[PDB]
Amino acid sequence: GIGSWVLHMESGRLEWSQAVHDIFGTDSATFDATEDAYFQRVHPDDRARVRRELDRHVLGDRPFDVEYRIVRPDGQVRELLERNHIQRQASGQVDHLWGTVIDMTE
Amino acid sequence: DAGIGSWVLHMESGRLEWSQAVHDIFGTDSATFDATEDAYFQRVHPDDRARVRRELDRHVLGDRPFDVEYRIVRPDGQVRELLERNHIQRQASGQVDHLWGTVIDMTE
Amino acid sequence: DAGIGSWVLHMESGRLEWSQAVHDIFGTDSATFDATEDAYFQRVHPDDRARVRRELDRHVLGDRPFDVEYRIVRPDGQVRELLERNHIQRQASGQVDHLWGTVIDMTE
Amino acid sequence: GIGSWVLHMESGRLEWSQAVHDIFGTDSATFDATEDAYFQRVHPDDRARVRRELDRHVLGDRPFDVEYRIVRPDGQVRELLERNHIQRQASGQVDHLWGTVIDMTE
């Protein structure tokens, strides 16, 4: 059926539902699951794309919007739109955020 | 009108860089504004500050699940098409602690 | 506490289905509440209604770009790895009018 | 370089930057671009995955959150969290939205 799984990054240690083994054709009691081992089951034509897709989604920019009101010093209240980008270093920790801010009060 | 504003928030430094275009939409002075994240929140409507904090944290630090398709090759030589749902779980630091999720064999 | 509420908004019908759990967080009566999208907005803080409308519209109807990787095969027999960025452009109806974007040959 | 492109859904008519032709190895002046034609350039091992990925992203559920305050009849003001799912029919038109609403006022 649907296999549950958990990867521990720091160690690469991998945990697999019996469902997952059935899917991969591996053997529960014996097959020691690690990220590196997982990638050997991955079709060779696919290994490289899957690494880039993981990285893109996990380390790369996942944009997003926040709307909020601000208060000018003269008490004026503006509706802004903030477009947010995330910049992560190798580790995954935010290095910086950046983006635009649009005054929508029109 | 000064148009679109662009900005950078340094995490280590905490430094917040504003183009004069931002300062303009905020009604502030380049020369005199603290340029920090807190300073920004002091300028944000009081009724909105918690919400925004949560929405940021939710995007920068929350789970942002996704799919991946790929074939695997079983030990028995058989080829399988998989759908895999990924969930990320970070530490307060941003560092990814665990990924986790599900795989579906959709091989027909 | 009645806990989590779940809800469905029918588009054609405009009908809005609430579990009693929602009615509970809203302080309303199942038997007496109109169960429509407008009714919902009348119950939403006045300072928030425009924002929410925009955020919905932005998610349901806005561009939601994405990536796709795949190999192509040139007429000359050569194999290439592509990165493709997709942007969707809908009609007020939701119907997708155009997709559009970019492709990068990342073949090494 | 980076190729620009536009697909017109209703017709499947396809528009291609010269950049795109260079990439696909096709010939600007002659090669008539359509969605169906595009898919013939797609590697055969990839054709099927690319269709499912398009569909998933374009017709499928793209969840999202909205936070907002409500007003109980007794003037009480609650902060809620709304989790939104989108349900599209074949056409792409929203059939319905659905989801949860969580009272955060704690």
CB–CB contact C51 A65 (8 Å): no
Same domain, yes or no: A29 and A66: no
The first and second tokens of residue D94, run together, are 């929203």
Same domain, yes or no: B58 and B68: no
Same domain, yes or no: A34 and A78: no
Same domain, yes or no: A74 and A96: yes
CB atoms within 10 A of CB B84: 19
| Interface size between C and D, measured as CB pairs under 8 A | 150
Among candidates B40, C76, B69, which has minimal Cα distance to D41? C76
Nearest to B105 among A23, A45, A62 (CB): A23
Three-state DSSP string of C64-107: CCEEEEEEEECCCCCEEEEEEEEEEEECCCCCEEEEEEEEEECC
A83 and chain C: CB distance < 8 Å anywhere? no
Among candidates B62, C11, B40, C85, which has minimal Cα distance to A71? B40
Q: What letter does residue A25 receive in the DSSP assignment?
A: T
Within D1-106, strands assigned E span 3-8, 13-16, 64-71, 77-88, 94-103
Distances in Å between the Cα of A42 and the Cα atoms of A48, C45, C80, C96 are 9, 51, 20, 34
Contacts of D48 in chain C (CB under 8 A): none
Contact D72, C24 (CB under 8 A): no
Chain breaks in chain A (C to N over 2.5 A) after: none
Task: Classify strands A64-71 and C16-18 as parallel, antiparallel or unpaired.
Answer: unpaired
- What is the side-by-side order of every strand in the sheet holding D3-8? C66-73, C79-90, C96-105, D3-8, D13-16
Those residues with Cβ within 8 angstroms of residue B69's Cβ, 6 or more apart along the chain or in another chain: B81, B82, B83, B84, D49, D52, D53
CB atoms within 10 A of CB C94: 17
**Is residue B6 within a helix (H) or strand (E), and if so which, with residue range?**
strand B5-10
Contacts of C51 in chain A (CB under 8 A): 67, 79
Those residues with Cβ within 8 angstroms of residue C45's Cβ, 6 or more apart along the chain or in another chain: D68, D69, D70, D71, D77
Same domain, yes or no: A53 and A2: yes
Among candidates B52, B44, B47, which has minimal Cα distance to B28? B44
Same domain, yes or no: A17 and A52: yes
The helix/strand/coil state of B102 is strand
Task: Classify strands C5-10 and B96-105 as parallel, antiparallel or unpaired.
Answer: unpaired
Experimental method: X-ray
The first and second tokens of residue D77, run together, are 């003001």
Residue type, B47: D
Judging by beta carbons within 10 Å of its beta carbon (0-12, 13-18, 19+), is residue B70 exposed, middle or buried?
buried
**Is residue B18 within a helix (H) or strand (E), and if so which, with residue range?**
strand B16-18
Beta pairing partners, A79: A69
Distances in Å between the Cα of D104 and the Cα atoms of C54, D81, D88 are 22, 7, 29
Beta pairing partners, D34: D13
**Residue D54: CA count within 13 A, CB half-sphere:** 19
Could you write out the DSSP letters of every residue in A38-76? HHHHB-HHHHHHHHHHHHHHHTS---EEEEEEEE-TTS-
CA separation for the pair C18, C33 (Å, rounded): 10
End-to-end Cα, chain B, rounded Å? 59
Among candidates C37, B25, D67, D26, which has minimal Cα distance to A71? B25
Nearest to B71 among A46, A68, A97 (CB): A46
The helix/strand/coil state of D8 is strand
Contact B68, A53 (CB under 8 A): yes
Among candidates B103, B96, D30, which has minimal Cα distance to A93? B96
Same domain, yes or no: C79 and C97: yes
Contact C23, D73 (CB under 8 A): no
CA separation for the pair D1, C89 (Å, rounded): 24
We report the CATH number of the domain holding residue B107 as 2.10.70.100
CA separation for the pair A86, D16 (Å, rounded): 31
Same domain, yes or no: C107 and C58: no
CB atoms within 10 A of CB B93: 12
D85 and chain C: CB distance < 8 Å anywhere? no
Output the CA torsion sign for C58, D10, D56, C8: positive
Query: In which domain, by residue range, is C79 found?
Result: 63-108
The resolution in angstroms reads 2.4
Contacts of D48 in chain B (CB under 8 A): 81
Nearest to B26 among A7, A53, A70 (CB): A70
Q: How many residues does chain B have?
A: 108
Greatest alpha-carbon span in chain D: 70
Same domain, yes or no: D27 and D77: no
Name residues 19-58 of chain C within 8 A of D (Cβ).
22, 25-28, 43-45, 47-48, 51-52, 55-56
We report the CATH number of the domain holding residue A22 as 3.30.450.20
Q: Which of D23, D38, D60 is the last residue of a domain?
A: D60
The helix/strand/coil state of A29 is coil
Residue type, B104: I
A14 and chain B: CB distance < 8 Å anywhere? no
Contacts of B51 in chain D (CB under 8 A): 67, 79
Same domain, yes or no: B39 and B50: yes
Beta pairing partners, C103: C84, D3
Angle (nearest 5°) at CA D98 between D95 and D101: 160
CB atoms within 10 A of CB B11: 17
CB atoms within 10 A of CB B2: 12
Structural domains in chain D (count)? 2
The helix/strand/coil state of B66 is strand
CB–CB contact A4 B73 (8 Å): no
- What is the side-by-side order of every strand in the sheet holding C16-18? C16-18, C5-10, D94-103, D77-88, D64-71
Same domain, yes or no: A2 and A53: yes
CA separation for the pair A89, C54 (Å, rounded): 33
CB–CB contact D24 C76 (8 Å): no
Same domain, yes or no: A52 and A5: yes
CA separation for the pair B100, B88 (Å, rounded): 7
